[PDB]
Amino acid sequence: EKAIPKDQRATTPYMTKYERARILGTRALQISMNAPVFVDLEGETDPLRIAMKELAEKKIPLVIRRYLPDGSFEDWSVEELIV
Template sequence: MEENKFVVKIGPPRLTRFEKARIIGARSLQLALGAPPFIPIPVGVTDPITLAIKEIESKALPISIRRMLPNKDYQDIPIHYLLDAF
């Protein structure tokens, strides 16, 4: 049986610094407005930005990145595939 391997067709096979910044900003806003965290809150962490970074590092976020081309073609990529490249 063949294993289905996900291929990133648009852009680099890793999370860019701009994508990472946007994810951290959006998730920290959600956390600041009272959204429940996806991981247990580490001791001493009170900042939503730090907690959002920890969620990304633990690959707990169920978020996909939509990468678009000028001709309107796009690919939705779950971030856990982009984090595996680090």
């Protein structure tokens, strides 16, 4: 039920394609709602491209709650996840 502490977390340290797509979608939804960005914009306007560029530099400020079937859940930061 409680969050599994960071010291031991069985869930894979990798970033699944579903998690990557969901992170990009959430970050693009936030940016489309006039949210600050943490990358050099370079003139891009479509929020999805800005989200992709942020994920390229690991600048997306989100974490993943991987819900195990029992009920517990490991919180994995996007920065720590590998691609």
